[PDB]
Design a binder for this molecule. Sequence first.
Ligand code: MG
Ligand code: ZN
Lengths: 104, 251, 156, 292, 131, 145
Amino acid sequence: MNKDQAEKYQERSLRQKYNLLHVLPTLNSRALSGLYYKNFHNSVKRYQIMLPEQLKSGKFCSHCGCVYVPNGDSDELGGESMEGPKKCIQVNCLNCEKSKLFEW
Amino acid sequence: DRTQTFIKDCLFTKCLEDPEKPFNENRFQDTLLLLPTDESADKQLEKRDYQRINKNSKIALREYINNCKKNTKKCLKLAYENKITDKEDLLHYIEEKHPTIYESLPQYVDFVPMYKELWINYIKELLNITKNLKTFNGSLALLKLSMADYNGALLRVTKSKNKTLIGLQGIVIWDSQKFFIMIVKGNIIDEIKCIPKKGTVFQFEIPISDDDDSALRYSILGDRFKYRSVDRAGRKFKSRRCDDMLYYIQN
Amino acid sequence: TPSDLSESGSKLNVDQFISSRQFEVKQLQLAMHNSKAASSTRIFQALPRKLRRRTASHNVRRIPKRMRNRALREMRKGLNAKQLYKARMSIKLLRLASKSTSMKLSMPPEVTSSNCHVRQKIKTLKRMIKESSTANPNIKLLNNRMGSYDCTGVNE
Amino acid sequence: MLVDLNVPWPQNSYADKVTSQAVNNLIKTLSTLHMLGYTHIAINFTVNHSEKFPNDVKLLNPIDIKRRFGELMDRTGLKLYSRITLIIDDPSKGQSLSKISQAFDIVAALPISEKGLTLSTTNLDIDLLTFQYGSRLPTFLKHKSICSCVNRGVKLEIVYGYALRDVQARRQFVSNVRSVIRSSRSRGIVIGSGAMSPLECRNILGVTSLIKNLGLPSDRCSKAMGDLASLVLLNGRLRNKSHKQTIVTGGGSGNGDDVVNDVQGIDDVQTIKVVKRSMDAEQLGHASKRHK
Amino acid sequence: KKTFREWQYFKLSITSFDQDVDDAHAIDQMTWRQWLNNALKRSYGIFGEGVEYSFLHVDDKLAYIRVNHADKDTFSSSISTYISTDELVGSPLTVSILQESSSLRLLEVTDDDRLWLKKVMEEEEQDCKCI
Amino acid sequence: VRLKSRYILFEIIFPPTDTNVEESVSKADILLSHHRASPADVSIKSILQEIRRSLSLNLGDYGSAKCNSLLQLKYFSNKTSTGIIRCHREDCDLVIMALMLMSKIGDVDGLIVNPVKVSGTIKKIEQFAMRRNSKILNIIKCSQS
RNA sequence: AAACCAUAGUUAUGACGAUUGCUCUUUCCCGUGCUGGAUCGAGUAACCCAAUGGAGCUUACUAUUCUUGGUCCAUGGAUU
RNA sequence: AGUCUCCCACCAAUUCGUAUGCGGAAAACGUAAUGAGAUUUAAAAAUAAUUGUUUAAAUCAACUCAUUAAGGAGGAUGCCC
Ligand SMILES: [Mg+2]
Ligand SMILES: [Zn+2]
């Protein structure tokens, strides 16, 4: 395998994985969400390339693995509620009933 | 070192019966050894998060499979009792008369157009399917396909040890290690198909319609699809026996 | 000297070992056999299979995992009746890990009895056992040093 | 199903040019084999390992299955495969099997020495191990090596067609075949006929009688000629055409278009298979329900 | 309460791949016997020559030879080995074993030579079982 | 799975074929007149060649090829005319029949080849040969009286 | 200078003949059925072989190249 | 069969004086109840022995590791009663 064609194959595979991690089932089906999340992370671990922390912070859920999304393609919302602080800022979802809170 | 050797030869001709053997079979050691024989915190956090997400997703997939398997049976029995053959009729009927049982059933009509095209475009750009077909490379394309990802792919069972598994087409939702998960449709069939890989032959066709109507005829083999590299290369392969493939030639 | 030093250990050379000592071997053979020393036949007989044995390994032994784990427990770390047996097994495991070679080879590195302070623990647990209200003259007093008493049941 | 994998080609070195009489005799013997009855025939091309191999690809295969054999097959009705036997005696440095294995289909060996035999059994990626039944055996064949090689792949080949050559050769042929059958535990045995003319060919029953007189049972002979021959053909076809047994470019819809069976359809200058669209997403999954 | 194998039939046929020579040169019944004796003597010694066999229904390159059940292997191994050289034709001849039978039930044509052979062996089979 | 060998012990006996000389009728006299001696022109490659010729002449081509794979003369001396030939366990009867069918030597006529003991080991063959040699001396000592 | 000792003992366990039993298939019978009976046949395998004795573990075996018991949120057909 | 382990002399004790889940003289030995784990791990892989494939990675099944000392008495709960 040539290195120039291997790099391109790598970016193509990463693009395809992130694209499949999006549209209908990774949003709706929490099972497939977690599955494709695990697959993408096992694929990025094998290449040993660091991931951008800016997105790594608020990337996905930790209980099921759906994209944290509040309310050209009308889709499902990931996060149903996002309160103020009320003591401290938190975010909740629909797919499961757990919530993740961060401190200012 | 002739004399002491001759003396120990005369020494062996007393104990042993053939004195010249230990030197030829190398049984007289010249030497004998005398020695007693002799930024971490976020890493932990993300590893725990990934382990938890994996452990949850496994149970979620299991429960989804169980729910689908029960709902297919229930809806099929209700349809058979309900005097209903068509799918467009049963779907609307269970919509108006069974609200909850409809949120669990899947909708293949939306499972086709998203998955098929997003996989076809990716495979077309990966294998470099161009308007012209004079820029191909067979071995390199085979290596890429062995390294390629098959999540969200359409595969057809063309040959199998069981005479009933053949001819099944479906789009996969997850790639397991022993079983193969797809979804099939009929007039009233919406079965989630779990098919064994030990002794089956699959195939996938890529449509090419630049000017003419052409398609590539590719195929995979489950028996040896378990010991392949994933997403990369550089893994020591072993010749297994190349003998348990008799069903391929038999029929 | 028939032996030599090395970077690894001390090795023995058979060649000089028997070449230097030849007249002694001749004298021994003439002292053992007087009429058959000049002859050349087979004198010594093969070993009987009944007396033949088998060869073991060159290692010491392998400790069980349970005893090793309990030794690790004890080394790293009014009284009820079970706390008596606990302390007794604790001193037994300390003595084992101290003397036993297999346990030592199964112990983790950078761990010795001095750092673990076995002696003070032994003393404290022996103080506990002597506080455990032992009734020695109720057990019995025997006659010899090796355990040998009489087990005779009259009408029972 | 009968397979004959040892049809010799009238050429040993690339310096030779084959005349028309030899290819006509080969045509006659192929027609003879088709007359009485046969299913698969793979011709052999023997060459030596010591001399330099030409640095070409489109000149390494002097068989031309498409031009003459492709012209006769539509009238005959069978398929032909190209096989090469590497006769290796000493471990010389000339070794470029990565090209010959990919250009040919089946690669066999003919060792003369013990070191060459060991290296071909362990490291050399080959398909069949043939011994010189004309000459004597190199040394005493052991059991464990042959059994581990059979479990690992490569099997032994017995050439009963050589015994029809000379008078003194039959004794050495039998002395080698009996030793091979005794040392191979009668597991990995494939039989072939090394005849250069249709005059030394026989029927399946004659082969069965000869082999059962040699010492191997008849049912095992039929089993090895039926399934062990198809499997050793499939091995050499898939290791070259496909990848290391993971992805195959051949798709068997029914029971006739198989990677070893379908030879005129599958392209060879490349590995593509241009077929019209027969699988879309709107068709019913259940084949019993799917109707056109 | 069993059956004793008297002999076994063997369907032989001289198969030479030259019609220009086959239509010209003729083959009679003594040629077959001479070829058999020569094959036995070239492949074996007296052991092969002492094989009991007869000739039944000799035709143009077609013959039926009965060989004892004890030396069926010795017969079938020498048949598939020898090739005639300079016996009666400049073109070498070889024989191909069509089929074998041990119960006299075999199918070629609608002739009656098989029928009278079966007559004789019927009045002899009942005789051998009765005696 | 295991190479099974089988050795054959054979002896050369010369019958007193002489009708002009009357003979004594007893045990040891005929034992001595039958075990007189072997001629000078006697060797191992000369007996192996003769038995190979006889085997090829009586059995045939394949019959000699199957037996000549492990056909060797291990021990033989012309002083007593006792030889030990190695062969396989499958073709042992063929080798015995060839020894029986031995007509004559190329230069020496009027001799018989007698197979005495056959077994799959050389130790028991040597033991039986020693027993036979010891038994031979008994009738000799008895008749010398 | 021997300790020499095996209900195989030092790489021997050979040559065939006969009888019973087991698997499936071919047919008959009483009462559906029976570890039912009787013919017409095939098969009785594969892995492999001791060299002083015993126990534990792992690894090879049984596809017209003998068999047996159970299990399966494996699929295929039918009834409720 | 196998480059695996151990017994085939004792030692009121520098001699594994080891009452440690059960059986066992020992075993790099069999099995039982619970919890967890997957080059992101205690440790198996894509930078002592054995095996062609050589644990798992929907659920089950299989491997590894981490705990549960023997006997008698009192109270509570569940089953026939
Ligand atoms: Mg052994
Ligand atoms: Zn969630």
